[PDB]
Design a protein around this ligand. Structure first.
Ligand SMILES: *[C@@H]1O[C@H](CO)[C@@H](O[C@@H]2O[C@H](CO)[C@@H](O)[C@H](O)[C@H]2NC(C)=O)[C@H](O)[C@H]1NC(C)=O
Ligand SMILES: *[C@@H]1O[C@H](CO)[C@@H](O)[C@H](O)[C@H]1NC(C)=O
Ligand SMILES: *[C@@H]1O[C@H](CO)[C@@H](O)[C@H](O)[C@H]1NC(C)=O
Ligand SMILES: *[C@@H]1O[C@H](CO)[C@@H](O)[C@H](O)[C@H]1NC(C)=O
Ligand SMILES: *[C@@H]1O[C@H](CO)[C@@H](O)[C@H](O)[C@H]1NC(C)=O
Ligand SMILES: *[C@@H]1O[C@H](CO)[C@@H](O)[C@H](O)[C@H]1NC(C)=O
Ligand SMILES: *[C@@H]1O[C@H](CO)[C@@H](O)[C@H](O)[C@H]1NC(C)=O
Ligand SMILES: *[C@@H]1O[C@H](CO)[C@@H](O)[C@H](O)[C@H]1NC(C)=O
Ligand SMILES: *[C@@H]1O[C@H](CO)[C@@H](O)[C@H](O)[C@H]1NC(C)=O
Lengths: 47, 511, 510, 47
């Protein structure tokens, strides 16, 4: 759904998605990672 | 007095896991929180989830994002002020967006009947069917002149239906029905000439110049929420100078009621790790033209001659506010630093290059550059490291991590998920504040023997060092040090990686 | 700007004849509006005219009115008495024994506008004929923390003065007509009010930073600033040149920050004062800290470990009571190049004062002052050894800052000296204040120094009159024209020259 | 009239004097001198 550009937008195997409703692109980060691009591991939780 | 505080998420429109996992976080994050240090983003909450726990939020420094929610009612009934120390889409202190169901029904009731002050930024309401009554609040009072000129927000009628507002409502204003749950003006119903806000819907018995929202009384002690500095029970513009001038003797005297300035609060002494300026305020760094020759146990400084002994910013600040990891593009700016005046994010993407930020993969050899860093005034986060190398070398001479700033507001040292055989921070002797977390490091031993209870000094410093190699599983690889070193563990195998030495020794190594 | 006068500070003493004493008291307060120092009215007779005191709007120190036979004292426009100093200790206002042998003295004292007495207590005693004042409830004029220590007992006599217009509140009244009623604004204020009020209502009270009263309820609508005066407003503290940044935990540049100079907040420091980094104009750098100016301005950093000496100077600290350098504590001037204050070479030092118990000074101890390079305040010399013809001890005196001046005018004053010549061949600057050299019988050369260069501040004049003579000294001395260029000379000798010729030198001008 | 004490008190030929009216001493300084003890010469005036 996200353009070739945003291809690589989301790190840690997160998937980029297009918020048609708000015309934007966000990340559906895998559980455990936070931040707009899922850059940080959620240290204050597990492992 | 003292309120419970939370960092506040800050990854707008991004979804953390599944609608549920996302939820569990929002809950885990704001549960019991009374003040939100950073941001308050409520997004993706669903049809029948319980956001009751938000009734504890009295204030949010940054902004409030509420977009993409199917939930029907949001309990932010007790939010009082939104400082707006940060914005959404620029110039937005409160951004409520696209709260609809595929069925055209999502957010309906927003009980923000106490949101009375939004110090900075503009508010945006757009595409949120079912939203009721909110379209009646006159923000000329909630917002402040300087922005209600950039605040976009129109409300649209929906297919559903909602009751009106009790005839006790002002010029209509009402965040819902309840009881007198009508927007209560305290900025406009004020008299011709009154300092700032007022509680008297007309009387000249209005609020103190230093108060946002309102005030139970007219004094400086009786106020809903302080606008700037909170000194004990009072609201201050600036805090009691340690030294007051003397108009009679044209000289300077000391001030008994003088306090130090920490954040927005006004302390009696600065936290053992912050820099105390002769002025009398706690800061996180001394000028570009200074040192940090801590004296009477308290860190202080004196100006040098122009540019001083290298003071690099460190990822995430000023010239790096946008970068999220030390990398080729601009690692160059760490050529001869002995002190990183910020944090250090060594991330995975750095080594593989982000084609989104247009940055080439970092040359492993370049990390040698840092081999000259002696101290990090903030936090050191490392979620990556070169493959064919088993030792956090670039940081072999790091001796101090001040923890003036920490990860998630909690961690000052974080070595997680590496394949390194050992740490190797054999020079580290201080972790002023923050917690240490070292985990997920498959084959990393020795760590479980650091006696950190010495390496750092501040009430509350914990050490979540889990799921690594295996003690009763590493003694086999002879990977230990217990014999030549001492009780205070080791940073590696060699006789130079000891924390403490048995029988004083030389050569930065022991034997 | 309000006209300000120094204000006599010589309590109970009498300056000459009852008239001479008047004339002075007149010359000092004629036109004043703000008395920076003290307001002392004493020994003014039965028919003199003290109408000029009608312009005094406020007195900084204390107001002493005693031993007067005049009947009416026009301090009608006095508004506030700071109380920076006290009389007899614990008194900002003291009206004492103002009667004539015939028990007939001060009668009316129209202080209808006096509303505030910031620091100190009031005292009235032995003032027959004083009218109305007997009715003034000061509980409003004075501050609670002082009434406990303020004595005042009014009395009666074989006379009488008219009652008080019923328009006057609790009977209180300073005078008769002109609604001389006690305009009270403190005990008459809504339970919950900043400080003083201009009305009874809880919506009629003044700013928590004002004195007497106010026209409006803001900071710009005040009768008299309680502490500092920021342009046209009243401030407690003055705009810092730096404001802390809560969010960044760092310091940001001055909002509309101003420097502090007395009770006024200036945009810049009088060039001859020290500017601290804090943003204040001080007369002296504390601790063991230098005073090295850099930005053209006199900032002042500290000097590694035990720095150097700090010679306070007559009139301050260890010498607030010492009124002239003398043998007793001249020792405290042994080795220092900067007098951090003033210097009074008074005749009493040389003759010994039998009242303070101090032995006459040994003229061979002024060589102690041979090491002084600069003087922050002013240099006053009214005496000087006879068997000497040159101000020697001050040979190396290079600069006088004038941060403080005699009477609040002169930074250099050498009068009544039998010296043939000054002898200040090092002096190169007189920051501010006027210089006066007179009453120096056989003193010459002086009338040629062209001081317009020696000092740097607007309006610095120089009263050098009645010394020896230009046409009379020409004989046995005077002129130096030759070795000393058209600039002039601090003497005849080549060294005394002000400017040599063609770079020529060798300490002198050969 | 001033105690053997206050002898010398009034400098510059000023004459000492008892103010029985307030039980205090003070000086009747010569014309031209100011100060509780005539210690200073009124510069701002003449000579
Ligand atoms: C060596 O460390 C690297 C870190 O760079 C590990 O790389 C994994 O890479 C995959 C895909 O690129 C990620 O999904 C993992 O998160 C990375 N590992 C973790 C948990 O950090 C790699 O696992 C390590 N190699 C070994 C010894 O297995
Ligand atoms: C906060 O969330 C936790 C999550 O398990 C929940 O158990 C708790 O009831 C909530 N509120 C409290 C009591 O802190
Ligand atoms: C709204 O105004 C602010 C200034 O207050 C400006 O910074 C912001 O960019 C403006 N919004 C836009 C993008 O028009
Ligand atoms: C009510 O509020 C509206 C919007 O601010 C304003 O136009 C109107 O005049 C107010 N009614 C009055 C005058 O009380
Ligand atoms: C690192 O990469 C970022 C990616 O945006 C770049 O902008 C930054 O300048 C680079 N500098 C560093 C952190 O070495
Ligand atoms: C830092 O590197 C520079 C450039 O090579 C060098 O001149 C300097 O000596 C190094 N650090 C110091 C101050 O020793
Ligand atoms: C007193 O005031 C009058 C009028 O301004 C003036 O002429 C006179 O010189 C003043 N007294 C002196 C000499 O200061
Ligand atoms: C009276 O009170 C004042 C107020 O501070 C105090 O200084 C003084 O010592 C007290 N007693 C005297 C000397 O009258
Ligand atoms: C001069 O005498 C005073 C007392 O009148 C004494 O305190 C002081 O020490 C003397 N001045 C000097 C040179 O210190």
């Amino acid at each position: 759904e996200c353009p070739l550009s945003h291809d690589g937008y989301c790190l840690h195997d997160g998937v980029c998605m297009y918020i048609e409703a708000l015309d934007k692109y966000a990340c559906n980060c895998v559980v455990g990672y936070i931040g707009e691009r899922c850059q940080y591991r959620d240290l204050k939780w597990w492992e | 007095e003292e309120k419970k505080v939370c960092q506040g998420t800050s990854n707008k429109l991004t979804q953390l896991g599944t609608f549920e996992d996302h939820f569990l976080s929002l809950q885990r994050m704001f549960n019991n929180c009374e003040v939100v240090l950073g941001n308050l983003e409520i997004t993706y909450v669903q049809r029948n989830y319980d956001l009751s726990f938000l009734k504890t939020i009295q204030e949010v420094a940054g902004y409030v994002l509420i977009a993409l929610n199917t939930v029907e009612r949001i309990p932010l009934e007790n939010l009082q002020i939104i400082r707006g120390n940060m914005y959404y889409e620029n110039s937005y202190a409160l951004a409520v967006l696209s709260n609809y169901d595929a069925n055209k029904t999502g957010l309906k009731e927003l009980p923000m009947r106490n949101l009375q002050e939004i110090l900075h930024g503009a508010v945006r309401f757009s595409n949120n069917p079912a939203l009721c009554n909110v379209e009646s609040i006159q923000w000329r009072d909630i917002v402040s002149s300087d922005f209600l000129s950039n605040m976009s927000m129109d409300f649209q009628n929906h297919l559903g239906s909602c009751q009106k507002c009790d005839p006790s409502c002002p010029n209509g204003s009402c965040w819902g029905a309840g009881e007198e749950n009508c927007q209560k003006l305290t900025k406009i119903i004020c008299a011709q000439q009154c300092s700032g806000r007022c509680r008297g819907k007309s009387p000249s018995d209005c609020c103190h110049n230093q108060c946002a929202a309102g005030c139970t009384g007219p004094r400086e002690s009786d106020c809903l929420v302080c606008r700037k500095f909170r000194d004990e029970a009072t609201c201050k513009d600036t805090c009691p100078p340690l030294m007051l001038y003397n108009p009679t003797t044209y000289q300077m005297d000391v001030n008994p009621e003088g306090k130090y300035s920490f954040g927005a609060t006004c302390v009696k002494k600065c936290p053992r790790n912050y820099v105390v300026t002769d002025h009398g305020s706690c800061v996180r760094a001394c000028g570009a033209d200074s040192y940090e020759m801590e004296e009477d146990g308290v860190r202080k400084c004196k100006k040098c001659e122009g540019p001083c002994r290298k003071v690099c910013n460190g990822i995430g600040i000023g010239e790096f506010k946008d970068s999220l990891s030390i990398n080729a593009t601009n690692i160059k700016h760490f050529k001869n630093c002995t002190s990183i005046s910020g944090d250090l994010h060594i991330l995975p993407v750095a080594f593989r290059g982000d084609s989104f930020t247009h940055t080439p993969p970092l040359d492993p050899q370049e990390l040698d550059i840092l081999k000259t860093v002696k101290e990090i005034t903030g936090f050191l986060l490392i979620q990556a490291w070169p493959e064919n190398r088993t030792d956090l070398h670039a940081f072999e001479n790091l001796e101090i991590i001040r923890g003036r700033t920490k990860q998630h507001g909690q961690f000052s040292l974080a070595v997680v998920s590496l394949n390194i055989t050992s740490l190797g921070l054999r020079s580290l002797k201080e972790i002023s504040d923050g917690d240490v977390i070292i985990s997920g490091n498959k084959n990393l031993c020795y760590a479980n023997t650091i006696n950190w209870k010495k390496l750092f000094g501040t009430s509350g410093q914990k050490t979540k060092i889990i799921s690594n190699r295996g003690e009763n599983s590493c003694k086999a690889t002879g990977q230990v040090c217990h014999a030549l070193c001492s009780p205070e563990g080791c940073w590696g195998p060699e006789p130079r990686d000891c924390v403490s030495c048995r029988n004083v020794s030389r050569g930065r190594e022991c034997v």
